[PDB]
Amino acid sequence: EVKLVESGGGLVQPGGSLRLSCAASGSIFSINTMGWYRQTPGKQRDLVADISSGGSTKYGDSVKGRFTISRDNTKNTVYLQMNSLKPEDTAVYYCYGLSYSNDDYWGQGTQVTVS
Amino acid sequence: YMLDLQPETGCIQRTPKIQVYSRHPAENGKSNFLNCYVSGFHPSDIEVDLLKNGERIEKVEHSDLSFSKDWSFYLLYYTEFTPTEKDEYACRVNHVTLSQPKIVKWDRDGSHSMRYFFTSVSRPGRGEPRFIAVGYVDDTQFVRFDSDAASQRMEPRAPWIEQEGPEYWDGETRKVKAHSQTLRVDLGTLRGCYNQSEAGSHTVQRMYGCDVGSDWRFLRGYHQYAYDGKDYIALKEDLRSWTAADMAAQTTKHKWEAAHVAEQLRAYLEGTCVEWLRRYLENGKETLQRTDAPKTHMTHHALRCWALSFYPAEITLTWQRDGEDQTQDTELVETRPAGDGTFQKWAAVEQRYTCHVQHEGLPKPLTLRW
């Protein structure tokens, strides 16, 4: 039902920045919390940042201070401003969203590589 | 009352089972507690969120890290909430065994023992190992210590232990601090014996305690170690010899035999452990010596036998088709804490079937039928 359209990834130099974007399709009353997880070297994916429709944010410890998530809540689109990127930030960043019934939706992900 | 001896050592991942439930039966407008009970997982690092309408609940508390006999960890995450008609709740759990966070939705519609559990997890670069110690009398936690907490003291978690004076708390704080310092050394020691990198995170677990009968007399004692959720060395039931799991533990076994560690442990388990367990049972008799019979009922699916608000946690729920124990095609959920000292359980398998309840608080076992 819900489709998440991701963009803004790619290659960047150490210290550089990227701006990820994630837009949710369907009704505006279909998605609440939106954010990003990123693929760890192993099996797990770790929380990067997410934001509720009311603007309540939460950041993973390894990106606090450098990453900033924001929301244009007219379109259910969230933006992840990734500053001061390091080689250890290289991963596939998966957008995700939560319905108001706590159903999770996941995007295909965008590769981020820091030289 | 902890052991005043911390002998140094010489010399498999499990995914969490998740349960989301309320403390009491849900009633709109009635204040309640939403629980998320994770258990059976290893290692201990886990991320648990409580969700309300697709959004994280802010003020969420959790119990102190403990583990079971098989070394797997369990935690209770909880928060106070007033459920209404529209609101929907769930629990999201992230763990190294999961390719993505798992979400579980909330469906709105005798003998005694003293145990001490110790967990230390290394955090290379991030600082000193995270050390967590908890003490139990039966299924009631009464003391804790957390190396990351502010007090750096052994803290009370039961009303009946607050009686004890400063000499008690100073002694327990002294002993538990030496516990952590020994496990910190054991972590660095075991890393080299197993030829492991300095960057990885590893876990050491220590458990000991004593059982007494209904006469409050010694029955059995325990003192076992684990490394990365795997058995390392354990004291045998005779409290005189050791069981070593692999070649690294054989060296620790010989060092502990030469130092006569088992003699000092046997004195604690047969004497000191029993003595203070009896004091705790007396001082907390209103809490530790109560029996609460399970409130039982049944539901039919379009057959699930329920048991709520019982203590202690020891209970048995069995299904019988025409009197024969139907073990196959039977879903038995793990006993779970309600968060107020009581416990819950249910089993699932029409007139030919019966549910049997066995509990110490019941005069006679109960039989339930559709």
Numbering used by the authors:
A (entry chain B): 3 to 117
B (entry chain A): 1 to 11, 25 to 122, 144 to 336, 344 to 390, 397 to 417
The article reads:
Human MHC class I proteins, or human leukocyte antigens (HLA-I), bind peptides, mostly eight to 14 residues long, for presentation on the cell surface for recognition by cytotoxic immune cells. HLA-I proteins are composed of a polymorphic, integral-membrane heavy- or α-chain (α1, α2 and α3 ectodomains) and an invariant light chain, β2-microglobulin (β2m). In order to coordinate α/β chain co-expression and incorporate specific peptides during secretion from eukaryotic cells, a linked “single-chain trimer” (SCT) construct, coupling all three components into a single polypeptide, has been widely used. Success was ultimately achieved by isolating and recombinantly expressing the VHH domain from a novel, high-affinity, anti-β2m camelid antibody, allowing the crystallization of all SCTs tested.
Canonical presentation was observed for the 9-mer peptides, with residues p2 and p9 occupying the primary anchors in the B- and F-pockets, respectively, regardless of the SCT design background (YML 9-mers shown in canonical “binding mode 1”). Structures with or without the H74L mutation showed that surrounding residues in the A and F binding pockets were nearly identical However, the buried surface area of leucine increased by 6.5 Å2 over histidine showing a more favorable packing. The change in enthalpy when introducing the H74L mutation was found to be favorable with a ΔΔG of 1.9 Kcal/mol as calculated by DDGun. This modest change could translate to an increase in overall stability, but the peptide dependence of this gain cannot readily be explained by our structures.
